[PDB]
Amino acid sequence: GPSVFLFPPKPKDTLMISRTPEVTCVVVDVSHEDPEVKFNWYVDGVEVHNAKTKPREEQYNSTYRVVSVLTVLHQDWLNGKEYKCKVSNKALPAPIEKTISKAKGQPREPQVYTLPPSRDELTKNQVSLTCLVKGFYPSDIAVEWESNGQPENNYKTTPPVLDSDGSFFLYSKLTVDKSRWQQGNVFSCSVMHEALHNHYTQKSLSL
Amino acid sequence: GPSVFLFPPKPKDTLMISRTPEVTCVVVDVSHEDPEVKFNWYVDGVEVHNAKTKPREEQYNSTYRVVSVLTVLHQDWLNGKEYKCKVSNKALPAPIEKTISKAKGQPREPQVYTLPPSRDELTKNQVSLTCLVKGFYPSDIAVEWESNGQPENNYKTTPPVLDSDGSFFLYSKLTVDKSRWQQGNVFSCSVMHEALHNHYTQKSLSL
Amino acid sequence: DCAYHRGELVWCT
Amino acid sequence: XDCAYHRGELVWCTX
Ligand SMILES: *[C@@H]1O[C@H](CO[C@@H]2O[C@@H](C)[C@@H](O)[C@@H](O)[C@@H]2O)[C@@H](O[C@@H]2O[C@H](CO)[C@@H](O[C@@H]3O[C@H](CO[C@H]4O[C@H](CO)[C@@H](O)[C@H](O)[C@@H]4O[C@@H]4O[C@H](CO)[C@@H](O)[C@H](O)[C@H]4NC(C)=O)[C@@H](O)[C@H](O[C@H]4O[C@H](CO)[C@@H](O)[C@H](O)[C@@H]4O[C@@H]4O[C@H](CO)[C@@H](O)[C@H](O)[C@H]4NC(C)=O)[C@@H]3O)[C@H](O)[C@H]2NC(C)=O)[C@H](O)[C@H]1NC(C)=O
Ligand SMILES: *[C@@H]1O[C@H](CO[C@@H]2O[C@@H](C)[C@@H](O)[C@@H](O)[C@@H]2O)[C@@H](O[C@@H]2O[C@H](CO)[C@@H](O[C@@H]3O[C@H](CO[C@H]4O[C@H](CO)[C@@H](O)[C@H](O)[C@@H]4O[C@@H]4O[C@H](CO)[C@@H](O)[C@H](O)[C@H]4NC(C)=O)[C@@H](O)[C@H](O[C@H]4O[C@H](CO)[C@@H](O)[C@H](O)[C@@H]4O[C@@H]4O[C@H](CO)[C@@H](O)[C@H](O)[C@H]4NC(C)=O)[C@@H]3O)[C@H](O)[C@H]2NC(C)=O)[C@H](O)[C@H]1NC(C)=O
Ligand SMILES: [Cl-]
């Protein structure tokens, strides 16, 4: 029988008012011969009927991937409302139900620290500009970099690591040409998280 | 049928002369109506016959876990010698064969930088001593802290991350009581990797 | 007072 | 001679 994966909305989507978050319910292994899928969406046991079905994609491995997406309210998802997808199909004995929701647990606001490149690193072409983000919960976060107005794309950010106080932390590393750093350019670390004032904050970091 | 998982030895074991490294071969899902398991081993095609077998153990889920272990030579491993473990079982249409080796690719030497805790983090009861280990290959690595010859266990290391230039990097967060740090007590970040002079390097920091 | 990011509004309180 | 150690345990010696 088919399988069903329930995905949370994208963090920048729940966190920014300008963006529209959505819970995505995905049903794979849908048979070439009973591809009819019925959906029943619920919000805390309460049923809701405003969901949309994305067009059928044939996977070329003999099965269909059937997806139904449901918009969620920024305020409903942060408060912690549980979302439960229910998939039925002639090829599937009892209907299948799955449920997601904002990680449970008191949200903890992140402290953000920007650590300059160590003296020993100034021999290489490019230096490493570090951002420490620690002590947050949930782990769902967004972090990017920019320099006077303009975004700096050359960086890699670690997956959130479970710290020992129950919260999460991470590091973002921005690499810039040593010169840029040597000549007083200012670099800002933008962090976007549920438990921040206005779910946002930037930190400075120049020489 | 039964399945086969072939694991590398531990980095610390291949990186320390004083330790003995071994490749493990684990067979799970071994059936009672045929627990007999043959094992054949090949270092670079060349068969070898010194692979002890570890206590057979019951999983309580219906199946046996049969494990054979093969001591390797620090030298052989680091150089990149493919190990083949071959597993036969009456309840099995044809031998399974798994092979593992030192990640292929030009060993790069990891650069190590102790980043000090942010000016703006001394109003908390605990500051964050950071260790950056960039630009290393393969991602197999060890990393611990210590002070006055004494180990520091209150830290957490990120997993290794793939960088822009086809190498890996990682950060390790050591958490210490503000006071201690302020005292001046000196803390050292020990990094252990196949590409270091002597595999070992120890960047420290204080004030 | 409000927050922004590359333009786009983030949030207010 | 030219060796690395780690908490008493010998690591290696290239030399
Ligand atoms: C026939 O083909 C279909 C179609 O797939 C495709 O087939 C061919 C043509 C190639 O194109 C394939 O590579 C291609 O995928 C096959 O469908 C695949 O089926 C597998 C499982 O059978 C599904 O795996 C699940 O994947 C999700 C993650 O998937 C995201 O990422 C995928 C790549 O990383 C991407 O391909 C997916 O589309 C998906 O994308 C996300 O989508 C949302 C909304 O659309 C979007 O917002 C996201 O941004 C987007 N993410 C992206 C794009 O990266 C994964 O989460 C599942 O993992 C769980 O379950 C496993 C056990 O089932 C467990 O081992 C895993 O570790 C993981 O378990 C969980 O861990 C978390 C924390 O880590 C924990 O909280 C959970 O509780 C825990 N749950 C457990 C253990 O159950 C899962 O593996 C593929 O998505 C799916 N492919 C597609 C395209 O959907 C089909 O199987 C084929 N049939 C055959 C061959 O017979
Ligand atoms: C009966 O019981 C046993 C054990 O039961 C266990 O305990 C009970 C109480 C329950 O709670 C169970 O839920 C639990 O499983 C069952 O045996 C299990 O069988 C599964 C699969 O059938 C095996 O999964 C594999 O796990 C390995 C990694 O396993 C390590 O990590 C586990 C913790 O996450 C740990 O339990 C293991 O002991 C093992 O630990 C490591 O051991 C080494 C050496 O001993 C040690 O040095 C390490 O430090 C240690 N690490 C630790 C502790 O963290 C995982 O690698 C496998 O994933 C690969 O294979 C999948 C196919 O199954 C594939 O889908 C994945 O993508 C992945 O594939 C590989 O990826 C790599 C790199 O990407 C690469 O080689 C290839 O691309 C690819 N190779 C492939 C595909 O071949 C795999 O998921 C469990 O290990 C095993 N558990 C134990 C304890 O042995 C048994 O099935 C039960 N039978 C039933 C229920 O019917
Ligand atoms: Cl399922």
Q: How far is the CA of A3 from the centre of ligand 2 (A)?
A: 22
Instruction: Round to whole Å and give the CA distance between B57 and A166.
Output: 35
Instruction: Round to whole Å and give the CA distance between A180 and A178.
Output: 6
Q: Is B31 in the pocket of ligand 2 (CB under 6 A)?
A: no
SS3 A17: coil
Q: How far is the CA of A63 from the centre of ligand 1 (A)?
A: 14
Answer left, alpha or beta for residue A78, where phi above 0 means left and psi between -120 and 50 means alpha. Answer: alpha
DSSP state of A108: B
CATH 3.40.50.10800 fits A102-207, yes or no: no
Resolution in A, one decimal?
3.0
Instruction: Round to whole Å and give the CA distance between B68 and B54.
Output: 6
Q: Which residues have C-beta within 8 Å of that of residue A71, sequence separation ≥ 6?
A: A20, A21, A22, A50, A52
- Looking at all shown ligands, the one closest to residue B9's CA atom is 2
Q: Atom 79 of ligand 1 has which residue's CA nearest to it?
A: A5
Query: B70, B62 in Cβ contact below 8 A?
Result: no
SS3 A79: helix
Cα dihedral A102, A105, A111, A116 sign = negative
Instruction: Round to whole Å and give the CA distance between B186 and B172.
Output: 17
Q: Which residues have C-beta within 8 Å of that of residue B167, sequence separation ≥ 6?
A: B108, B134, B135, B136, B137
Burial A156-169 (b: 16+ CB within 10 A, else e): ebbebbebeeebbb
Q: Is the Cβ pair D11, B197 closer than 8 Å?
A: no
Give the residue among A32, A96, A98 at the shortest CA–CA distance from A70: A98
Lookup: tokens for A94: 């009892």
Instruction: Round to whole Å and give the CA distance between A105 and A202.
Output: 25
Lookup: tokens for A176: 């810039």
Instruction: Round to whole Å and give the CA distance between A63 and B132.
Output: 46
> What φ, ψ does residue B76 adopt, rounded to 5°?
-50, -45
Which residues 1-15 on chain D approach chain B with CB closer than 8 angstroms? 2-7, 9-14
A24, A97, A172, A192 from A8: Cα distances, Å: 7, 15, 23, 17
Q: Is the Cβ pair B156, A162 closer than 8 Å?
A: yes
Cα dihedral B68, B72, B77, B82 sign = negative
What DSSP assignment string belongs to B102-133?
A: S-SS--BPPEEEEEPPPGGGTTSSEEEEEEEE
Instruction: Round to whole Å and give the CA distance between A91 and A63.
Output: 13
Query: A114, A129 in Cβ contact below 8 A?
Result: yes
Give the HSE-up count for residue A54: Cα atoms under 13 Å, Cβ half-sphere: 16
Instruction: Round to whole Å and give the CA distance between A50 and B70.
Output: 59
Q: For residue A123, which residues of chain B lie inside 8 Å, CB to CB?
A: none
Q: For residue B117, which residues of chain A lie inside 8 Å, CB to CB?
A: 113
Q: Is A99 in the pocket of ligand 1 (CB under 6 A)?
A: no
Instruction: Round to whole Å and give the CA distance between B172 and B189.
Output: 9
Residue B205, number of CB atoms within 10 A of its CB: 19
DSSP state of A139: S
Q: What angle do CA A19, C12, A11 make, to 5 degrees?
A: 35
SS3 B22: strand
Instruction: Round to whole Å and give the CA distance between B91 and B35.
Output: 9
Which residues lie across from A143 on neighbouring strands? Answer: A191
Residue A80, number of CB atoms within 10 A of its CB: 13
Q: Which residues have C-beta within 8 Å of that of residue B65, sequence separation ≥ 6?
A: B26, B27, B28, B30, B56, B57, B58, B59
Domains of chain B by residue range: 2-101, 102-207
Q: Which residues have C-beta within 8 Å of that of residue A2, sequence separation ≥ 6?
A: A27, A28, A29, A30, A31, A87, A89, A91, A92, A96
Residue B140, number of CB atoms within 10 A of its CB: 21
Residue B159, number of CB atoms within 10 A of its CB: 11
In chain D, DSSP finds a helix count (H) and a strand count (E) of 0, 2
B22, B28, B56 from B50: Cα distances, Å: 11, 22, 18
Chains in touch with D (≥3 Cβ pairs < 8 A): B
* DSSP3 helix / strand / coil % (chain C, rounded to 5): 0, 55, 45
Q: Is A159 in the pocket of ligand 1 (CB under 6 A)?
A: no
